[PDB]
Amino acid sequence: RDKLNNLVLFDKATYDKLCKEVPNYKLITPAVVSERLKIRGSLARAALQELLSKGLIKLVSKHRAQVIYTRNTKG
Amino acid sequence: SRDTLYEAVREVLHGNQRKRRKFLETVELQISLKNYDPQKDKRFSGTVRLKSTPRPKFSVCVLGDQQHCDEAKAVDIPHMDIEALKKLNKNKKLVKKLAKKYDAFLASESLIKQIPRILGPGLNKAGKFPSLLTHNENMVAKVDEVKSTIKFQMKKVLCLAVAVGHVKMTDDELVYNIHLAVNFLVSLLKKNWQNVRALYIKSTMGKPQRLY
């Protein structure tokens, strides 16, 4: 009935709003980045290995099916 | 409906009980109508032709370039050329003032088309109608709007109101604005049927007087 139109690589604002507002959430899973920041699950995965490399997010537990990242803590 | 009784049309000198004001006044007339329809083809449009100037006071402009260049110098006229309308009837929306600034415009003879510009059917479409004439009369032919009769329109509230006199004139023009004034609006008649019931005579300010 409805057909979603997700983005495959970043537009100018979608990299800006990912590079800022991904750690400004509390959960970071590549299913909610695909939902909220309007991209595909593969990009949502590919856009978080480079934010773990940056020092903005933090990994909790890894699995083949689902990985759960979070904000970098207050401490 | 025929109404007249010029028997002893006096008691116009009874002024200083009917006035304890001081200033420049405008004497009016509101006449009584019953069963008129404005929604149908009943044309109550035109004038009642007075002779002896009740004398209105408002801003009058003259558009053109004629012998009237020399004639209307002694008026101390607000004269305006075509070279002073390219910012006048265009600056209408963005500047929110009454950008006409004078309460009349004009089309003449010798200037057969005054203005077929976008500011021609622009000016003759927003009231203060450019309707007065200055054909080739050439004795004054500008202040003869101030020295003219009176006009009145049909509308959707039916009531009529028009100025048959003014202050600063003799009282013997206000008996002359009873002779050549209301004798004609019985001849000026269609089956807007027997339109004249009663004529409530009244100055600028005063008390109900009655002459039929």
Next chain:
RNA sequence: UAGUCUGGCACGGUGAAGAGACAUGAGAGGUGUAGAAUAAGUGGGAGGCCCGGGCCGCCGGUGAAAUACCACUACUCUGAUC
């Protein structure tokens, strides 16, 4: 076409209650945004208005139209008689 059925009119009237009318007389009355203000609507109008001084406005601003100040009539509801 007789007769009959039916409506109007005349003969043909007094009185009470009630209604919808309409002439004589009355209040409150009208909300596109918006200008600070329930724009009825026109001839307005930069001047009036009150016991020597004071407010209402022009404008800024909504909108062919903004009051102090003279009248009539549109026309919705309550309600008054020779």
Next chain:
RNA sequence: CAUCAUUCUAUGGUUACCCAUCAUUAGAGGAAAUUUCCAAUAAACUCUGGUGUAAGGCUUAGAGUGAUGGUCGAGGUGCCCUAUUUAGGGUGAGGAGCCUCGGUGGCAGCCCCACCAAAUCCUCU
């Protein structure tokens, strides 16, 4: 290349009340149900002209200019039926008529997400 607004020049245009539209009248136009067809059938409403009234640049031609090189935000908009009546169950078509960037909640404001109504009915099943 399409489109809207804004400022300046076209031997260019009706105003003794018109312009947009509220009104009305004169005129050209169809899907699906209903299959295996064919032409029907018959709307709802939509325009130009005309008259009374209420906006104002019009609508025609030139160029500098907002902000589009693509647009508006793209969503809410119905009847039927039930002792789930602030709830619950249906899903045919083809047309016209209006509020704002919602008010809150949850990883709180953006991007999603749920909900509380804005103005809707006319009819060919």
